[PDB]
Design a protein around this ligand. Structure first.
Ligand SMILES: CCCCCCCCCCCCCCCCCC(=O)OC[C@H](CO[C@@H]1O[C@H](CO[C@H]2O[C@H](CO)[C@H](O)[C@H](O)[C@H]2O)[C@H](O)[C@H](O)[C@H]1O)OC(=O)CCCCCCCCCCCCCCCCC
Ligand code: CLA
Ligand code: CLA
Ligand code: CLA
Ligand code: CLA
Ligand SMILES: CC(C)=CCC/C(C)=C/CC/C(C)=C/CC/C(C)=C/CC/C(C)=C/CC/C(C)=C/CC/C(C)=C/CC/C(C)=C/CC/C(C)=C/CC1=CC(=O)C(C)=C(C)C1=O
Ligand SMILES: CC(C)=CCC/C(C)=C/CC/C(C)=C/CC/C(C)=C/CC/C(C)=C/CC/C(C)=C/CC/C(C)=C/CC/C(C)=C/CC/C(C)=C/CC1=CC(=O)C(C)=C(C)C1=O
Ligand SMILES: CCCCCCCCCCCCCCCCCC(=O)OC[C@H](CO[C@@H]1O[C@H](CO)[C@H](O)[C@H](O)[C@H]1O)OC(=O)CCCCCCCCCCCCCCCCC
Ligand SMILES: CCCCCCCCCCCCCCCC(=O)OC[C@H](COP(=O)(O)OC[C@@H](O)CO)OC(=O)CCCCCCCCCCCCCCC
Ligand SMILES: CCCCCCCCCCCCO[C@@H]1O[C@H](CO)[C@@H](O[C@H]2O[C@H](CO)[C@@H](O)[C@H](O)[C@H]2O)[C@H](O)[C@H]1O
Ligand SMILES: CCCCCCCS[C@@H]1O[C@H](CO)[C@@H](O)[C@H](O)[C@H]1O
Ligand SMILES: CCCCCCCS[C@@H]1O[C@H](CO)[C@@H](O)[C@H](O)[C@H]1O
Ligand code: OEX
Ligand SMILES: [Ca+2]
Ligand SMILES: [Ca+2]
Ligand SMILES: [Cl-]
Ligand SMILES: [Cl-]
Lengths: 202, 33, 49, 97, 35, 30, 97, 137, 334, 151, 243
C-alpha cells in the first residue's frame, strides 16, 4: 500500500476536524508526518480479528470500542472499572502490524495495545515529529477548510452589500428623508385606487 | 499559561489601529472653524 | 441551509418543531461548544440589548 | 440616573435598528464556521495546564465534562445511522449518578 | 474580626438612619407641582 | 502578559465611562 | 513505568470471578443464596489465603456451608489491592444502576 | 406488534405451569404497580436499593425463586431478603405489614396476581430497559 | 438653614449631575463595595471550594483564567445558606478558600440594584414624570434575584447561585437544563418570546421611524442633523410609517397611535422577562418543565421515541457528568 | 446492614461518605446533603446527641420505623414536572406526583412577586396623582425647562 | 448538662472533653480483665509543615500554617481493644470511629497543603508494667495513611484510577510519555507515627486526657506530586472501660 494512500485514510487530514482559533498549518497540531506505522490488526485471545470503531468528524473525543467482523462488541476501554466485562486485559487483546515501520511486530502489553487502539480511532497510524514546531497535539483544518470558511462568510456579508446598494440605487430620491409635504392621501387608505398613483384618485 | 505569542501584538493592534483612526478624525473635527 | 450543507447531510439541519429545535440547541452545546463562540456571544448581546 | 442619555431621536431609532440586526448577523457568521466544525471549542493554554496539572480546574474545564456527557449519552439515539453501541462500561459518569 | 464587625455595624446603621430620616423629612413635598 | 492586557483594556473602558459621562458633549436645548 | 493497578487487576482472576479479597459486595447477587447474609460474612472475614478458607467463618449453618461449597468454583482469591478496599468501597463502590 | 396472548403467558409456578393473563389483567397490574410500588420500583429498578432489580433473571436467582406468579404473590405477603434468610415486612410493603404500609390495606388476592403479572410481562415487552435504569431511558 | 435641612436639599437636589436621593444613599455605598470586591476578586482571588468537597475551582485572572473562563466563584456547599461575612472567618485566607467574596458581592449588589429601581421612581417624582420606568426595570432585576438569591434558597445553597463570570454562567445554564428541563418549561418559553420578540420589535420600530424621517438635510450630511434636541415638532411622519406597515401586513395589524405603540414596546419584553424570572424562581422549588419521556407507546407497549426523548438523552449526559465527585447516593435531590 | 463501618468510611473526595463535620464541628450527613445539616425532624432527632449525629446511636438504635420514614421521604422528595411526573427531570413517566410543598411555594412566589409589582405601580401612581402629574407633563409648565442645565 | 441546641454553631462540637485540675489520679489495671477504649478523641491545635529547601545544607524545619477548612478537624468516637501484654504494657488496637478528617492548611505565601489527618488502624503501646494508668503513662504507635482521595475520584479533565479516562483527551495526538504521571493515577498508602502523653486521669471514671503529637505525609494528589511532611499537635481525651 503506498504511504500516500494510507495517509489520506487518517482523520488528521480531514478538514472538518479543526477549530476557529487553532491557527497555522496542520503540522502544528498532530506534528510533521514522518512515516506510516503500518496497518494495525487487533485480535482477542481466541484469535478473532477485531476492528476499532473510527471517530466521526463531529466528535472532539471518542471512546475506544472494538467489534468483530459482524459489528458485535468484543473489547473496549472502560470508564468505570468495577463492572467492566470487555477490557483489553480480560479479553487478552493484542495488536500486530503489517506494512510500514512496525511491519511484522506484535504487541501484547495491555497499555501499549491500548495506546495503539486510541490511534486507530483516527484511521491509519503515523509517526510524527512533534518537536520541530512544538506541536500541541490538537487537530487543525487545511487550506480547503480555511478557504471554504472565508468564502462562505464573505459571500454572506456581500449579500448585505447587495441589498444595501440596491436600496440606495432605487431609493436615491429619499436618501436624506421623505418628501416634507408628502400627501396624507398617498399613505392613508381609501383615496387612491392604485397604491402610490395620484391619477387613480376616488 | 502557554498562550499564543502573537496574542499580545494582535490584541494591541486591534485596539490601537481603529482607535487612533477615530482620534485622528475627532481632533481634526474640533479644529475646524 | 449552509450549516447542513457543510455537514454530512440535511439530517443535521434543525427539524421544524418546538422540541426538535431544543434538541438542536443542546447538540450545539455538546458538540460545538457553541456558547463559547464569540460570534454567538455578539448575537446574545444584540438580542438581549 | 445612568450618566448618559440619548439627545438625538434620529440616532436613537437608528440604534434600535442597528443593535439586534448586527447581533443576528454576527450569530450567522458563527454558524457558517460551525458548518465546517470550525468551532471555538477550546482554549489551548487551558488544556496544556489542565493536562499537566491535575489540581487545576475552571468553569471552562467543567463545561467540557458536561459536553462529553451530552455526546456519549445522546449520540446513539440522535444519530441512528451510525449504529453506535456504547457498552455501559464506556459511558462517562461521575460518582453515583 | 470583632473590630471589622463593629465598624461595619456602625457604618450600616448610619446609612440606614439617613435613609429612614431622609424619607421622613417632608418627602411628599419634594416634587415640582402640588405640595 | 495576558493578565496585564485584560486589566489594561478593562481600565481603559472605566476611564472611557468617566469621560463619556463627565466630559460629554452637553445637550443644548436651543 | 507507572501502572493503573485496577486495570492490571482486571487481567488476573479478579476479572473472571468473585475475588473474596477485593470484589465489591454487590457481585454476590450473581449466584443463588449468597446475598446479603453470606456476602456480609465473607467481606467481613476477608482476606483469605485460599478460596476454601471461606468455610472457616464461625457460626455458619449447615445450609450456609453447603451453599458456600456449591459456589467455590465461582470464587477466587488474589492479593488485597488497597485501591479496591479503602473507602468502604467493598460495601459501596459508588456504582448504582 | 401487539400485546398478544403469548406475550401475556407467563410462569405460574416453579414446576413449569403457565397462566395466560387477560388484557384487563395487564392493565390492572400496571395501574396497581403504579399505585403501590412504582415510587421505589419505577421501570423495574429499586431506588432505595439499586443492587436488586425486578428483572426476570434476577428474580429466578432469588430464594425462594421469584420468577413466577406464586413466588411474587408470596413476596407481597411475606417479603424476604434475596437469600430468603430474613423477613423484611417491617421495612417493605406487604399484606402482613398493611398496618404500617396502608396502601396495602385494600389489595385483594386478585390484585397481587395482577401486579405479579405486570412484573413478569413488562420485560417481555421492554427487554433490557426493564430494570436497566437511566442508561436505557 | 440648619445642617440636616441643607443635607436633605442636597440629597434630593434635581441639579446634581447624577441624582443621589434617599435610595441613592443606600445604592452608592453598596454598589461601590460590590464593584470593588468584584474587580479585585476577578483579578486576584485564589481558588474556591464551591462544591464543599475540597476541590477548589480557580476563578481569577492571575490564577490561570482569561476573560471568558474567569469568574467570582460561588460560596462553598458546606456553608449552604449560612451567612458568611468576613468576620465569621478565622482569617482572610479561610474566607477566600470558602468563597466569601461571592456572598459579599451578591448581597451588596442585590441591595444596591433594588435601590437603583427605587431611585428611578424617586427621580421621576422630582421631575414631574409619570412613575413606571422603575416597573420596566423590575424585570431584569427580578431575573437577577432569581439566579443569585431565590434559586439558592430553594436548593438550599449559595453554591447553586449563578457564578459571576462568562463560562460560569454557561455552567449554571447546562446544569439547570439537566435538573429542571427548563427548555420545556412554558415560562422560559415566554422568556424567549419576550427577548426574540423584544429584539424583533426593536428592529421593527427603529426601522419604521428611520424609514419615515422628514427630509431636513443634504446628501453630504448625516440625516441625524435633521433633528435638534428639544425641538417641538416630531421628526418623522408616523402616518407614512403606518401607511407602510399596514400595507406590509394589513391595516389593523399596524399602530397609528404612538402612545399605544410605545406601551406595547414596553409591555412585550417586560412581561416575557417577568415570566422567565418566575421560571427560574419556581424551578427553584423544583416544579419543572414538561416531561414527555416515554409518552408515546405502540400497541405492544414498545416505547416510540419523540424529540422529547432525545432531549432526555442530552439531559442525562449533563446530569451524570456534573459535579462528578460530589454525589455518593443515587438521586440528585438538590 | 451489609457490614460497613459508616464512621470510618472515607468517600472519594476524602470527606466521609456517610458522615462528616459541619463547619462548626457537629456530626452531619455527608454527600451533597452537607448543605442541609440544619434540618430537624422527628424521625431523625433520636439519633442526635449534643455533638450532632451520634455514632453509637446510629450503630445500635435505628428503629424500623425510622428506616421506613427515611425511604418514604427519600422517594417523595419535592421534585417533579409541570405535568406531574414525579422525580428528577430525566425520570420516565410512571409516578404521578408533585409535592404540595412545591405547588404551594411556587404559586405564592408568583403571587408575591406580581404583588410587589402592583405595589410599585400603585405607589408610584398615587404619588404622581397626589402631586398632579399622573396624566403627563404640562407642556407650558414643564418642570425641567425651569431647572438649570446639568452642564 | 449541654444539649445539641446549646452547642450548635458555637465551635464546641469540634473540641474534645476536658478533665478538671483535680484529675491527678490512677486508674487500676487488672491483668486478668479485658479492656477497651470506648471513646478516643483527638483535637488538633497546631498543624506544622516541613519546608522543602533547595539545598540539603541545613535541616529543614517545621513551620506554622493557617487552617482554611474551619472547625472540621477533630477525630472522635474512636474505639477499640486495650490489650494487657505479658510485660504489663497496654496496646490500643483501633477498630472503628470517626478516625480521619480532610484538612487544608496554607503556608506563608499561599501554597495549600491538603492532608488526610488520621489514626486509621492505629496500634499504640505504653511502657512496660502499667499496673495503673497515671499522669506518667505514654502511648506510642503507628497508623496507616491511605490516599487522601479514594479510587473513584476524577480529576478536572475526567481522569481517575477506578473510573475516568486514561489519557489527556483534549490533546488527542500529544505524546503520552510526558503526561504519564498525570494520566496514570496511583493510590498511596504510607505510615504515620503518634505519641500520646497523659496529663490527667480520673481513676474513678476511667477517663484520661492529655497532649499528642503525630507525623504523617500530606496529599500526593493520586501520585501527581510529592507529598509534604506534616506534624500535628493537639489535646486528646479517652474513656477506658472493662469489656
Ligand atoms: C396552553 C393554552 C394557553 C392559553 C392562554 C391562557 C393561559 C391559561 C392556562 C391554560 C392551561 C389549561 C390546561 C388545563 C388542564 C390542567 O390543568 O390539567 C391538570 C389538572 C387536571 O388534570 C389532572 O392533573 C393531575 C395533576 O397531578 C396531581 O394529582 C395527582 C393524582 O392525584 C397527584 O396527587 C399529583 O402529585 C398532583 O400534582 C393528574 O395528573 C391527573 O391524572 C389529571 O387528571 O388540572 C388542574 O390541576 C387545575 C389547575 C389549577 C391551577 C393550578 C394553580 C397552581 C399552579 C402554580 C402556579 C405557579 C407556577 C406555574 C408554572 C406554569
Ligand atoms: C480569505 C483569506 C485567507 C485564507 C482562507 C487564509 C488561509 C490561511 N492562511 Mg493566510 N492571510 C490572509 C488571508 C487568508 N489566509 C491575509 C489577508 C494575510 C495578511 C494578514 C494572510 C497572512 C497569513 C500568515 C502570515 C499566515 C497565514 C497562514 C494561513 C493558514 C492558517 C490560517 C489561520 O490560522 O487562520 C486563523 C483565523 C482566525 C483566527 C479567524 C479570524 C476571525 C477574526 C478575528 C474575526 C474579527 C471579528 C470582528 C472584529 C467583528 C466585527 C463586529 C462588528 C461589525 C460589530 C491558512 C491556509 C499561516 C500559515 O500557515 O502559513 C504558511 C501563516 O503563518 N496567512
Ligand atoms: C432576499 C433576497 C433578495 C432581495 C430581497 C433582493 C432585492 C433586490 N434585488 Mg437582488 N438578488 C438576489 C437576492 C435578493 N435581491 C440573489 C440571490 C441574486 C442572484 C445573484 C440577486 C441578483 C440581483 C441583480 C443582478 C439585481 C438585483 C436587484 C435587486 C433589487 C430590485 C429587485 C430585484 O431585481 O429582485 C430580483 C428578484 C429576485 C431576487 C427573485 C428571484 C426569484 C427566483 C427567480 C425564483 C426561482 C425559483 C427556482 C428556479 C426554483 C428551484 C430551486 C432549486 C433549489 C430546486 C432589490 C434591491 C437589481 C438592482 O439592484 O437594481 C438596482 C439588480 O440589478 N438582484
Ligand atoms: C441568553 C441566552 C440566549 C440568547 C439571547 C440567544 C440568542 C440567539 N441564539 Mg443562542 N443559545 C443559547 C442561549 C441564547 N441564545 C444557549 C445556552 C445555547 C446552547 C449552545 C444556544 C444555542 C443556539 C443555537 C444552536 C442557535 C442559537 C441562535 C441564536 C440566535 C437566534 C436568532 C433568531 O431569532 O432566530 C430565529 C429564526 C430566524 C430569525 C429565521 C427567520 C424566521 C422567519 C422570519 C419566521 C417566519 C415565521 C412565519 C411567519 C410562520 C410562523 C408560523 C407559526 C405557526 C409558528 C440568537 C442570536 C441561532 C443562530 O446563531 O443563528 C445564526 C442558532 O442556530 N443559539
Ligand atoms: C394558590 C393557588 C393554588 C395552588 C397552589 C393549587 C394547587 C394544586 N391544584 Mg388547585 N385550584 C386553584 C388554585 C391552586 N391550586 C384555583 C384558583 C382553582 C380553580 C381553577 C383550582 C382548581 C383545581 C382543580 C379542579 C384541580 C386542582 C389540582 C391541584 C393540584 C395540581 C395542579 C396542576 O396540575 O396545575 C397545572 C398547572 C397549570 C394549569 C398552570 C397554571 C399557570 C397559570 C396560568 C400562571 C398564572 C400566572 C399569573 C397569575 C398571571 C399574571 C399575568 C401578569 C401579566 C400580571 C395542586 C396541588 C388538581 C388535583 O390534583 O386536585 C386534587 C385538580 O384536579 N386545582
Ligand atoms: C477585572 C475585570 C477584567 C473585569 C471584567 C470582567 C468581565 C466578565 C467583563 C465583561 C466582558 C464583556 C463586556 C463582554 C460583552 C462582550 C460582547 C458579547 C459584546 C458585544 C459586542 C457587539 C459588537 C455585539 C453586536 C451586537 C451589538 C451592537 C450590541 C450592542 C448592545 C447595546 C450596547 C445595547 C444598548 C444597551 C444600553 C444599556 C443602552 C442605553 C440606552 C439609553 C441611555 C436609553 C435611555 C433613553 C431611552 C429613551 O427612550 C429616551 C427618549 C432617552 C432620551 C434615553 O436616554
Ligand atoms: C402561483 C400563485 C397561486 C400565485 C398567486 C399569488 C396571489 C395573487 C395570491 C392572492 C391570494 C392570496 C393573498 C392568498 C394567501 C395565501 C396565504 C394565506 C399566505 C399566508 C402567509 C402567512 C400566513 C404569513 C405569516 C402571517 C404574518 C405575517 C403574521 C404577522 C403577525 C404579527 C405578529 C404581526 C405584527 C403585528 C404587531 C402586534 C405589530 C406591532 C409591533 C411593531 C411593528 C412595532 C413597531 C411599529 C408599528 C407601527 O405600526 C408603526 C406606525 C411604527 C412607527 C412602529 O414602530
Ligand atoms: C494595519 C493592519 C494591522 C491591523 C490588524 C491587526 C491584527 C488584528 C487581529 C487579527 C487576529 C487574527 C489572528 C489570530 C491571532 C493569531 O495569532 O493568528 C496567527 C495566524 C498565523 O498562525 C501561526 O502560524 C505559525 C507558523 O506559520 C505557527 O503555526 C503559529 O502557531 C500560528 O499561530 O495568522 C493568520 O493565519 C492570519 C490570516 C488569517 C486568515 C483568515 C481567514 C479567515 C477570514 C475570516 C473572515 C472573518 C470576517 C468576520 C467579519 C465580521
Ligand atoms: C449610578 C451611576 C451609574 C453609572 C454607571 C456607568 C455608566 C456607564 C455608561 C456607558 C458610558 C460609555 C458610553 C460611551 C458612548 C456614549 O458616550 O454615548 C452617548 C450617546 C448620546 O447619544 P446622542 O443621542 O446624544 O448622540 C447623538 C448622535 O447624533 C451623535 O452622532 O448615547 C447613546 O448613544 C446611547 C446608546 C449607547 C449606550 C451604550 C451603553 C453601554 C453600556 C456599557 C457596555 C460595556 C460594559 C463593559 C464592561 C466591562
Ligand atoms: C487593585 C487590585 C489589583 C490586583 C493585582 C494583584 C497583584 C498582586 C498580588 C500578586 C498575587 C498573585 O500571586 C499568585 O500566587 C500563587 C501561589 O500560591 C500562584 O500560583 C498559581 O499559579 C498559576 C498561574 O498561572 C495558577 O494558574 C494557579 O491556579 C496557582 O497555583 C500565582 O501564579 C501567583 O501569581
Ligand atoms: C504507548 C506508546 C506506543 C506508541 C503510541 C501510538 S503511535 C505514536 O503516536 C504519538 C502521539 O502522536 C505520535 O506523536 C508518535 O509519532 C507515535 O510514535
Ligand atoms: C490592592 C489589593 C492587593 C491584592 C492582594 C493580593 C493578595 S496578597 C498576595 O497573595 C499571594 C497568594 O497568597 C502571595 O503569593 C503573594 O506573595 C501576596 O503578594
Ligand atoms: O451543587 Mn451545584 O448541582 Ca443543584 O443538584 Mn445536586 O446540587 Mn449539585 O448536584 Mn445537581
Ligand atoms: Ca512540546
Ligand atoms: Ca504526662
Ligand atoms: Cl459541573
Ligand atoms: Cl450525595
Amino acid at each position: 500500500i503506498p504511504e500516500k494512500l494510507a495517509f489520506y485514510d487518517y482523520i488528521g487530514n480531514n478538514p472538518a476536524k479543526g477549530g476557529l482559533f487553532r491557527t497555522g498549518p496542520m503540522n502544528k497540531g498532530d506534528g510533521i508526518a514522518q512515516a506510516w506505522k503500518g496497518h494495525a490488526v487487533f485480535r482477542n485471545k481466541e484469535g478473532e480479528e477485531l476492528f476499532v470503531r473510527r471517530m466521526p468528524a463531529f466528535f472532539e473525543s471518542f471512546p475506544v470500542i472494538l467489534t468483530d467482523k459482524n459489528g458485535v462488541v468484543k473489547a473496549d476501554i472502560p470508564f468505570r472499572r468495577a463492572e467492566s466485562k470487555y477490557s483489553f486485559e480480560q479479553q487478552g487483546v493484542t495488536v500486530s502490524f503489517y506494512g510500514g515501520e512496525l511491519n511484522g511486530q506484535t504487541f501484547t502489553d495491555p497499555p501499549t495495545v491500548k495506546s495503539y487502539a486510541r490511534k486507530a480511532i483516527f484511521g491509519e497510524i503515523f509517526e510524527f515529529d512533534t518537536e520541530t514546531l512544538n506541536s500541541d497535539g490538537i487537530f487543525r483544518t487545511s487550506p480547503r477548510g480555511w478557504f471554504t470558511f472565508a468564502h462562505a462568510v464573505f459571500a454572506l456579508l456581500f449579500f448585505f452589500g447587495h441589498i444595501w446598494h440596491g436600496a440606495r440605487t432605487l431609493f436615491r430620491d429619499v436618501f436624506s428623508g421623505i418628501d416634507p409635504e408628502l400627501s396624507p392621501e398617498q399613505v392613508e387608505w381609501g383615496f387612491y385606487q392604485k397604491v402610490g398613483d395620484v391619477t387613480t384618485r376616488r | 499559561m502557554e498562550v499564543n505569542q502573537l496574542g499580545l501584538i494582535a490584541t494591541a493592534l486591534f485596539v490601537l489601529v481603529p482607535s487612533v483612526f477615530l482620534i485622528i478624525l475627532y481632533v481634526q473635527t474640533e479644529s475646524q472653524q | 441551509l449552509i450549516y447542513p450543507l457543510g455537514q454530512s447531510s440535511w439530517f443535521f439541519a434543525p427539524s421544524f418543531g418546538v422540541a426538535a429545535i431544543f434538541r438542536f440547541l443542546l447538540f450545539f452545546q455538546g458538540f460545538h461548544n457553541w456558547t463559547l463562540n464569540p460570534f454567538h456571544m455578539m448575537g446574545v448581546a444584540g438580542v438581549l440589548g | 440616573i445612568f450618566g448618559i442619555a440619548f439627545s438625538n431621536k434620529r440616532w436613537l431609532h437608528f440604534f434600535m435598528l442597528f443593535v439586534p440586526v448586527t447581533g443576528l448577523w454576527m450569530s450567522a457568521i458563527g454558524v457558517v464556521g460551525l458548518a465546517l466544525n470550525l468551532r471555538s471549542y477550546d482554549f489551548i493554554s487551558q488544556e496544556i495546564r489542565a493536562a499537566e496539572d491535575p489540581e487545576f480546574e475552571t468553569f471552562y474545564t467543567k463545561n467540557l465534562l458536561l459536553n462529553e456527557g451530552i455526546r456519549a449519552w445522546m449520540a446513539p439515539q440522535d444519530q441512528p445511522h451510525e449504529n453506535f453501541v456504547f457498552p455501559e462500561e464506556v459511558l462517562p459518569r461521575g460518582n453515583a449518578l | 474580626m470583632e473590630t471589622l464587625k463593629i465598624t461595619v455595624y456602625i457604618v450600616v446603621t448610619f446609612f440606614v438612619l439617613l435613609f429612614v430620616f431622609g424619607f421622613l423629612s417632608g418627602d411628599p413635598a419634594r416634587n415640582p407641582k402640588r405640595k | 502578559m495576558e493578565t496585564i492586557t485584560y486589566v489594561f483594556i478593562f481600565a481603559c473602558i472605566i476611564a472611557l465611562f468617566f469621560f463619556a459621562i463627565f466630559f460629554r458633549e452637553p445637550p443644548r436645548i436651543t | 513505568e507507572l501502572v493503573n493497578v485496577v486495570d492490571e487487576k482486571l487481567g488476573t482472576a479478579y476479572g473472571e470471578k468473585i475475588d473474596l479479597n477485593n470484589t465489591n459486595i454487590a457481585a454476590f447477587i450473581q449466584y443463588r443464596g449468597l446475598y446479603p447474609t453470606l456476602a456480609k460474612l465473607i467481606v467481613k472475614n476477608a482476606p483469605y489465603e485460599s478460596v476454601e478458607d471461606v468455610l472457616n467463618i464461625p457460626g455458619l449453618t449447615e445450609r450456609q456451608k453447603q451453599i458456600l461449597r456449591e459456589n467455590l468454583e465461582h470464587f477466587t482469591v488474589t492479593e488485597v489491592e488497597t485501591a479496591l478496599v479503602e473507602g468502604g468501597d467493598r460495601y459501596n463502590n459508588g456504582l448504582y444502576k | 406488534a401487539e400485546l398478544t396472548p403469548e406475550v401475556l403467558t407467563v410462569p405460574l409456578n416453579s414446576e413449569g405451569k403457565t397462566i395466560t393473563l387477560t388484557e384487563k389483567q395487564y392493565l390492572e397490574g400496571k395501574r396497581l404497580f403504579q399505585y403501590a410500588c412504582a415510587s421505589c420500583h419505577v421501570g423495574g429498578i429499586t431506588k432505595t436499593n439499586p443492587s436488586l432489580d425486578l428483572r426476570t433473571e434476577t428474580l429466578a436467582l432469588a430464594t425462594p425463586p421469584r420468577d413466577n406468579i406464586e413466588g411474587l404473590v408470596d413476596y407481597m405477603k411475606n417479603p424476604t431478603t434475596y437469600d430468603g434468610e430474613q423477613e423484611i415486612a417491617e421495612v417493605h410493603p406487604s399484606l402482613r405489614s398493611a398496618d404500617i404500609f396502608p396502601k396495602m390495606r385494600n389489595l385483594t388476592e386478585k390484585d397481587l396476581v395482577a401486579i405479579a403479572g405486570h412484573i413478569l410481562v413488562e420485560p417481555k415487552i421492554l427487554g433490557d430497559k426493564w430494570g436497566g435504569g437511566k442508561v436505557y431511558y | 438653614a440648619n445642617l440636616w435641612e441643607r443635607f436633605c436639599n442636597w440629597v434630593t437636589s434635581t441639579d446634581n449631575r447624577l441624582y443621589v436621593g434617599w435610595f441613592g444613599v443606600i445604592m452608592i455605598p453598596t454598589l461601590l463595595a460590590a464593584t470593588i470586591c468584584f474587580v479585585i476578586a476577578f483579578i486576584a482571588a485564589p481558588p474556591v471550594d464551591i462544591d464543599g468537597i475540597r476541590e477548589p475551582v480557580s476563578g481569577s485572572l492571575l490564577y490561570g483564567n482569561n476573560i471568558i473562563t474567569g469568574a467570582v466563584v460561588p460560596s462553598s456547599n458546606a456553608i449552604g445558606l449560612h451567612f458568611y461575612p468576613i468576620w465569621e472567618a478565622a482569617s482572610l485566607d479561610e474566607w477566600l478558600y470558602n468563597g466569601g467574596p461571592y456572598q459579599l458581592i451578591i448581597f451588596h449588589f442585590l441591595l444596591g440594584a433594588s435601590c437603583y429601581m427605587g431611585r428611578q421612581w424617586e427621580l421621576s417624582y422630582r421631575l414631574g414624570m409619570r412613575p413606571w420606568i422603575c416597573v420596566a426595570y423590575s424585570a431584569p432585576l427580578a431575573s437577577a434575584f432569581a439566579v443569585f438569591l431565590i434559586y439558592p434558597i430553594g436548593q438550599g445553597s449559595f453554591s447553586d447561585g449563578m457564578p459571576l463570570g462568562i463560562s460560569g454562567t454557561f455552567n449554571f445554564m447546562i446544569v439547570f437544563q439537566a435538573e429542571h428541563n427548563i427548555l420545556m418549561h412554558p415560562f422560559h418559553q415566554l422568556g424567549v418570546a419576550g427577548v426574540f420578540g423584544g429584539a424583533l420589535f426593536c428592529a421593527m420600530h427603529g426601522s419604521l421611524v428611520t424609514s419615515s424621517l422628514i427630509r431636513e438635510t443634504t446628501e453630504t450630511e448625516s440625516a441625524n442633523y435633521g433633528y435638534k434636541f428639544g425641538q417641538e415638532e416630531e421628526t418623522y411622519n408616523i402616518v407614512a410609517a403606518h401607511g407602510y406597515f399596514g400595507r406590509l401586513i394589513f391595516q389593523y395589524a399596524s399602530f397609528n397611535n404612538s402612545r399605544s405603540l410605545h406601551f406595547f414596546l414596553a409591555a412585550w419584553p417586560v412581561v416575557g422577562v417577568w415570566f422567565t424570572a418566575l421560571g427560574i424562581s419556581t424551578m427553584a422549588f423544583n416544579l419543572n418543565g414538561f416531561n414527555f419521556n416515554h409518552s408515546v407507546i405502540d400497541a405492544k407497549g414498545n416505547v416510540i421515541n419523540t424529540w422529547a426523548d432525545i432531549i432526555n438523552r442530552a439531559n442525562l449526559g449533563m446530569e451524570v457528568m456534573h459535579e462528578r465527585n460530589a454525589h455518593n447516593f443515587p438521586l440528585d435531590l438538590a | 446492614k451489609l457490614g460497613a463501618n459508616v464512621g470510618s468510611a472515607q468517600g472519594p473526595t476524602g470527606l466521609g461518605k456517610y458522615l462528616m463535620r459541619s463547619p462548626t464541628g457537629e456530626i452531619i450527613f455527608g454527600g451533597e446533603t452537607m448543605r442541609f445539616w440544619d434540618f430537624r425532624g422527628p424521625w431523625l432527632e433520636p439519633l442526635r446527641g449534643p455533638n450532632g449525629l451520634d455514632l453509637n446511636k446510629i450503630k445500635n438504635d435505628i428503629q424500623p420505623w425510622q428506616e421506613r420514614r427515611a425511604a418514604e421521604y427519600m422517594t417523595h422528595a419535592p421534585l417533579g414536572s409541570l405535568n406531574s411526573v414525579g422525580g428528577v427531570a430525566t425520570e420516565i413517566n410512571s409516578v404521578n406526583f408533585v409535592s404540595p410543598r412545591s405547588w404551594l411555594a411556587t404559586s405564592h412566589f408568583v403571587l408575591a412577586f406580581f404583588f410587589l409589582v402592583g405595589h410599585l405601580w400603585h405607589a408610584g401612581r398615587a404619588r404622581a396623582a397626589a402631586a398632579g402629574f399622573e396624566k403627563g407633563i404640562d407642556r407650558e409648565s414643564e418642570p425641567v425647562l425651569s431647572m438649570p442645565s446639568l452642564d | 448538662t449541654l444539649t445539641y441546641d446549646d452547642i450548635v454553631g458555637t465551635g464546641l462540637a469540634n473540641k474534645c472533653p476536658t478533665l478538671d485540675d483535680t484529675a491527678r489520679g490512677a486508674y487500676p489495671i487488672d491483668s486478668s480483665q479485658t479492656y477497651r477504649i470506648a471513646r478516643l478523641c483527638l483535637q488538633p491545635t497546631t498543624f506544622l509543615v516541613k519546608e522543602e529547601p533547595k539545598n540539603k545544607r541545613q535541616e529543614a524545619e517545621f513551620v506554622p500554617t493557617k487552617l482554611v477548612t474551619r472547625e472540621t478537624t477533630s477525630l472522635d468516637q474512636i474505639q477499640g481493644e486495650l490489650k494487657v501484654n505479658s510485660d504489663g504494657s497496654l496496646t490500643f488496637v483501633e477498630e472503628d470511629g470517626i478516625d480521619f478528617q480532610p484538612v487544608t492548611v496554607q503556608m506563608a505565601g499561599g501554597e495549600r497543603i491538603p492532608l488526610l489527618f488520621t489514626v486509621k488502624n492505629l496500634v499504640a503501646s505504653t511502657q512496660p508494667n502499667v499496673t495503673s494508668i497515671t499522669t506518667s503513662t505514654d502511648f506510642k504507635g503507628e497508623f496507616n495513611v491511605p490516599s487522601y482521595r479514594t479510587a473513584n475520584f476524577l480529576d478536572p479533565k475526567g481522569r481517575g484510577l477506578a473510573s475516568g479516562y486514561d489519557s489527556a483527551i483534549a490533546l488527542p495526538q500529544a505524546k503520552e510519555e510526558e503526561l504519564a504521571r498525570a494520566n496514570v493515577k496511583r493510590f498511596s498508602l504510607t505510615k504515620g507515627q503518634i505519641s500520646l502523653n497523659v496529663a490527667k486521669v480520673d481513676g474513678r471514671t476511667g477517663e484520661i486526657a492529655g497532649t499528642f503529637e503525630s507525623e504523617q505525609l500530606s496529599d500526593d494528589d493520586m501520585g501527581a506530586h510529592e507529598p509534604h511532611e506534616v506534624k500535628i499537635q493537639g489535646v486528646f481525651y479517652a474513656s477506658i472501660e472493662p469489656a
